[PDB]
Design a protein around this ligand. Structure first.
Ligand code: HEM
Ligand SMILES: COc1ccccc1O
Length: 403
């Protein structure tokens, strides 16, 4: 235990979920690599340390403890070597930029319009539930082959998997403090199995253009498919973050723009600025805030800390994206910040595989929103609360417009 960091013993899991930025501002200054007792792990808080660990030859991926309890093996985020190479080859075809550009407009734009048509003349909406989450899940769900799974159900599953995979608190002995918090993750997985097993049965015999059919068949000898137990953990990884994060990025970008009314006006007037607005939104409130980790494979010294082999380090990219070595007043959303590197998609061989797709989902969603409701305003009678340490985003976004 590091003596000058004794204050970390009193940091709680609830504090980090409600708002992790004050604790992490101290970590960035005091200890860029620091052991946080309630998380049971070293955490990397600065841009230099996160990028170093994520790209180091002396580290490889490891799943967080609660992530492992939630996803099992081989989750694409938690494995390395030949298995990781295979799972990357499995997921990459539909995410290739030239491929996304073929069909992303015809996928997302009619989905955004469908959800907008439900409320665009109301004069009020809660955009997280009514727009950002539905467009995110319906887009990806259709790409995957889950057309028949309602957006309400996809939203419920990612919320249960989020809480399970971020159920990280440990007690004085390093044991999970809230073991009952994994039960709703187990229940989501059981429901997913009941829906998806018959789809896999069908795709094995009758392949189609759905992404999960391609995960079963691509790259395989004739008449063979990847075993469903081998792909289900990556299906679960998708049904948490890939379903959740484009909605979170959309919504955080909107909260940021509302916080800078002159910048919201600029972006509504000039939608070619939407990609810049989104990149700043991701830096400003990173959707994947501290959900992944790496483990040393040899003894290594990082940020002055001598780590043995086998040491996990959580990558708190959402903190690294407020590093004041890189950014001026990072807690302020600013469209006009210079377009600098950021870590909201991670780094290294385990960096996000879906960046290009995700950026287009968020872009098309915001384009359609501002076209439909150009006089959109935040409802300032309602607070926006952000929640989450592992995955972070606004829990609601009440808006109003003159009808
Ligand atoms: C704005 C939305 C998104 C954000 C901010 C985001 C961010 C991230 C981050 C931070 C990681 C971990 C990287 C690391 O540990 O260094 C990651 C991993 C990953 N993401 Fe994205 N993600 C988003 C959307 C998506 C979508 C929509 C997909 C799929 C269609 C996707 C697929 C993946 C995959 C497959 C991985 C695992 C990569 C690996 O471990 O090799 N992401 N993402
Ligand atoms: C793409 O989904 C994830 C990325 C990182 C950690 C958990 C996820 O579900």
């Amino acid at each position: 235990e590091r003596p000058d960091l004794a204050w970390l013993d009193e940091v709680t899991m609830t504090q980090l979920e409600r708002n992790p930025y004050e604790v992490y501002e101290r970590l960035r200054a005091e200890a860029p690599l620091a052991f946080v007792p309630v998380l049971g792990s070293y955490v990397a808080s600065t841009a230099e340390v996160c990028r170093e660990v994520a790209t180091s030859p002396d580290f490889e991926a490891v799943i967080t403890p609660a992530g492992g309890r939630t996803f099992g093996h081989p989750a694409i985020i938690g494995v390395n070597g030949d298995i990781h190479a295979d799972l990357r080859s499995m997921v990459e075809p539909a995410l290739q930029p030239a491929e996304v550009d073929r069909w992303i407009d015809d996928l997302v734009r009619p989905i955004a319009r469908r959800y907008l048509e439900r409320f665009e003349n109301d004069g009020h909406a809660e955009l997280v539930a009514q727009y950002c989450e539905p467009v995110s899940v319906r887009s990806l769900g259709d790409l995957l082959g889950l057309q028949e799974v309602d957006s309400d159900k996809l939203r419920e599953w990612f919320a249960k998997l989020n809480r399970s995979a971020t159920n990280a608190a440990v007690d004085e002995n390093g044991e999970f403090a809230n073991p009952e918090g994994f039960a709703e993750g187990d229940q989501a997985k059981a429901e997913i199995r009941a829906v998806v097993d018959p789809l896999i049965d069908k795709w094995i015999e009758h392949p189609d253009d759905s992404a999960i059919s391609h995960w079963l068949h691509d790259g395989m000898p004739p008449g063979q498919t990847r075993d469903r137990e081998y792909i289900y953990p990556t299906i679960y990884v998708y049904l948490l973050g890939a379903m959740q994060e484009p909605g979170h990025g959309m919504a955080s970008t909107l909260v940021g723009l509302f916080s800078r009314p002159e910048q919201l006006e600029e972006v509504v007037d000039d939608p070619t600025l939407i990609p810049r607005a989104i990149a700043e939104g991701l830096r400003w409130t990173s959707p994947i805030w501290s959900a992944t980790a790496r483990i040393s494979t040899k003894p290594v010294t990082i940020a002055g800390v001598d780590l043995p082999a086998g040491t996990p380090v959580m990558l708190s990219y959402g903190s690294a994206n407020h590093d004041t070595g890189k950014y001026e007043a990072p807690s302020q959303y600013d469209l006009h910040r210079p377009p600098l590197p950021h870590l909201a998609f991670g780094a290294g061989n385990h960096a996000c595989a879906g960046i290009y797709f995700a950026n287009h989902v968020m872009r098309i969603a915001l384009e359609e929103l501002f076209e439909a409701i150009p006089n959109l305003e935040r409802d300032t009678r309602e607070g926006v609360e952000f929640w989450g340490w592992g995955f972070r985003g606004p829990t609601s976004l009440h808006v109003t417009w003159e009808v």
